[PDB]
């Protein structure tokens, strides 16, 4: 059904709350140097294997998302989420989730 902006924001707050838990738990069971769980205001990026592309299904709670696609981040061999080259922002590809990209 036609989700409203207020409903969408509510689901984001609920998803953001789930991301806080997944972070606290991992930060209570630490192991190795993987990329840490991270909330980017859209979805919760999970533990990333270092040196690899991390793929996350386009979240089901975003109404205007293609839920058959994936969003992507890059986790380097140091366990840090890779920045965009030449910029100071974390690299993420959402082109599969959305029509205007």
């Amino acid at each position: 059904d036609v989700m409203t902006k207020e409903e969408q924001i509510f689901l984001l707050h609920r998803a953001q709350a789930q991301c806080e838990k997944r972070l606290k738990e991992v930060l209570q069971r630490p192991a190795g140097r993987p990329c840490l769980p991270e909330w980017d205001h859209i979805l919760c990026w999970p533990l990333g294997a270092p040196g690899e592309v991390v793929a996350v299904p386009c979240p089901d709670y975003i109404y205007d998302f293609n839920h058959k696609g994936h969003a992507y981040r890059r986790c380097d061999r140091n366990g840090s989420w890779e920045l965009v080259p030449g910029h100071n922002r974390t690299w993420a590809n959402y082109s599969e989730c959305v029509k205007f990209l």
Binding site: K5, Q8, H41, I62, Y63, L101
Partner: peptide
């Protein structure tokens, strides 16, 4: 489309949070 307020809100999240330019 649907709610343009919802759509245009997602425009902002995608604009700052899709960073591959």
């Amino acid at each position: 489309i649907q709610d343009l307020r919802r759509r245009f809100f997602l425009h902002h999240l995608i604009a700052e949070x899709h960073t591959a330019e």
